[PDB]
TrEMBL record, chain E:
Pfam families: Oxidored_q4. The lineage of its organism: Eukaryota, Metazoa, Chordata, Craniata, Vertebrata. This is NADH-ubiquinone oxidoreductase chain 3. It catalyses: a ubiquinone + NADH + 5 H(+)(in) = a ubiquinol + NAD(+) + 4 H(+)(out). Core subunit of the mitochondrial membrane respiratory chain NADH dehydrogenase (Complex I) which catalyzes electron transfer from NADH through the respiratory chain, using ubiquinone as an electron acceptor. Essential for the catalytic activity of complex I. GO terms for cellular component: mitochondrial inner membrane; respiratory chain complex I.
Amino acid sequence: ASTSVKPIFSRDMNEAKRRVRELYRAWYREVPNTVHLFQLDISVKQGRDKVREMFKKNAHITDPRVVDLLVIKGKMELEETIKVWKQRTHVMRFFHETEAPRPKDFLSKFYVGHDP
Amino acid sequence: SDAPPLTLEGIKDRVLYVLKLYDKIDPEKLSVNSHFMKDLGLDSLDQVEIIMAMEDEFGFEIPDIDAEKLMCPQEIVDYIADKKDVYE
Amino acid sequence: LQYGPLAYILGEKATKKMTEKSKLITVDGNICSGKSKLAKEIAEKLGLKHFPEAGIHYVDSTTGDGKPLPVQFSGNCSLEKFYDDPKSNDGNSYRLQAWLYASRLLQYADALEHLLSTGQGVVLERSIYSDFVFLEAMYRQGFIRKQCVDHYNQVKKVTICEYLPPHVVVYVDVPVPEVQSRIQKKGNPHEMKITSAYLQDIENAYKGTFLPEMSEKCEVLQYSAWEAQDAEKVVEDIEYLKYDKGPWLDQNDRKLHKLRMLVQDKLEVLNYTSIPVFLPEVTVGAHQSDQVFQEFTELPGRKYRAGYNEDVGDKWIWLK
Amino acid sequence: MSMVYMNIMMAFTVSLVGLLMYRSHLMSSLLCLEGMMLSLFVMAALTILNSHFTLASMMPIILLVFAACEAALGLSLLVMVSNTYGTDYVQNLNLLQC
Amino acid sequence: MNLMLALLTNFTLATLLVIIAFWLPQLNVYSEKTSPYECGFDPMGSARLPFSMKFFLVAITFLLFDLEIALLLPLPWASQTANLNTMLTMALFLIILLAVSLAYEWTQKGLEWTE
Amino acid sequence: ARQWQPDVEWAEQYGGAVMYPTKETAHWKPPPWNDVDPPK
Ligand SMILES: Nc1nc2c(ncn2[C@H]2C[C@H](O)[C@@H](COP(=O)(O)OP(=O)(O)OP(=O)(O)O)O2)c(=O)[nH]1
Ligand SMILES: [Mg+2]
């Protein structure tokens, strides 16, 4: 049948959502010494808040194969921050400290330009 | 010495102590049989953070399969007692 | 000239006698997995020698005449009784595990000596490294207590750290449902009582804590029930191994001298197997221990040192 | 005696007290052990050279050769402590008797 | 009076150049200017260099060889002795016992670097 | 009526770190059976 599709790691959501939790634990117990080695100027508080935001955006997913990739890519993004392959700039590219706000209210977009 | 045997009453004071120092939980409604998600209004990841917090004060690994069942402070206390062999 | 520092000086160095085929092969498996049939052929087609799996009477096989001794001089541990009433209050469960580990530990010392004495390889069934599968299977089912596990672990760490792991580990896989059926047709009334949940722990231990840890030290060649039926494939696979990992790569004559002087003396292999930890299961009262030790010396050829026993027709005792 | 004999012996007492009062570091004590030898080397040489004790002129050299050799033994022990605890603090050496 | 005056000059001049080299130039240091060079990349870890045993043996081996040198330095004066038979025996004893030290380290794999 | 020989309770008195436990020595433990503390 066409609907049947080969899996990646998990055969259903219940098994797939286990890895999200195991991945989350790795990140939560890695920020404090990530902020230490990289000598960042962000507290462990808002560092952990950032990981909360990243997961929360991929919360509407319902496909076990899509979730596996988002975990596989999540594990890679962690191996770079533990083996310090990333430099100080790469870790600070999540926090967007150099892009001016882009307001969402209609008037602000109307005043500035033609975009929606 | 200075390491008395663990007790269920003793554990429940250690368990609740961590939950007190959690900015997302109101200490007034902490209770001891209050569910983390039914009434306290916590999301799934909040429970995971608590279980991780419970491990530092009780040094031992809680496998994720076990963490799926610990959803109230009493169950946390029962789980540790079921693991460290303290019955009283 | 008995081996010793003088013999090592005079030339009996280990590396001058071991060839490229001097290896110590271990063949593992589950109950009724047919490891014995497989094991007897790996030794046969590699010019090695075979060691039957350590039974409760293994020690009696290498001492005296070599025949099994009455059950009293074994702790009254009987394999049959384990299956009938595994939850017995007399503590026969763990006392069976404790005794079998000692026999396997003694067997391993005999194996290492043979490899280091003449150079010939050796094939062994479940060894001291895989013996813990049964112990932790028993604990989960409730056949032993937590304290029985602690006593076993202490004896293991202070005794297993002195030896070298196997060169090649030949693991045979047999799904538990198949294991049950093989148990039925062999007609063993005591064995047929083995609860299935018990045979699942042996599999969980074998592939959950044994293979992953031993794969980073030794050579692992996993097989299935159908594959293991043929011995030529196993032998040729075991003849085309790289041997790129293991403690045996950092071994020289000096460190093998320290090993051979230990395997040679058996009262040093067993020294910690009777550490003074007063467990209810393995402790023996003073009156019972003394009474049994008195009977043992009254057997043929056990009263004096081997070679000075007139009752077995020894001669020259007055000049030997 | 002489003013020099006072200050050279003053240097031996100071080094001894430093050797008998450990702070935290095994290495820092080994230096005090070598400081004592230096004062003994100076004291012996002053007296032997100042008294024209010719055949005794080789004694300071024998003192230095053996004292240096023992220091090499001491350094080896210090290194082996570092491979076992990740530092050279004396307080890590409390397994025996406690 | 002449050796001390010469020693002071060689170390006074060496010092005078260091003071005029940290003060004459114009300095402007910021955070990344003063960071250790590394290799252009952020450091991997925060633990000092692990101990290497091979480097300690060469120091010790140099020391003990250097100690047997001091016993041989007086050889030029030791050859003016009337009893040459004894001197030539001891001189070749010290040197021979210095070759056995080398032979022992050589054969015990002490002069190798392949861990 | 047999002769009395020591039991487990009598024997364990000699199985401690010190013969006379006190406040200061309560933390002690018997050494390893092989005189080898695990590496760490
Ligand atoms: N509790 C416990 N039982 C053991 C231990 N070693 C063997 N046994 C038991 C399990 C089995 O019921 C019995 C024999 O096991 P086997 O490995 O020899 O299986 P079997 O002989 O039936 O077939 P096979 O040898 O493979 O040809 O002995 C042990 O270390 N602990
Ligand atoms: Mg069998």
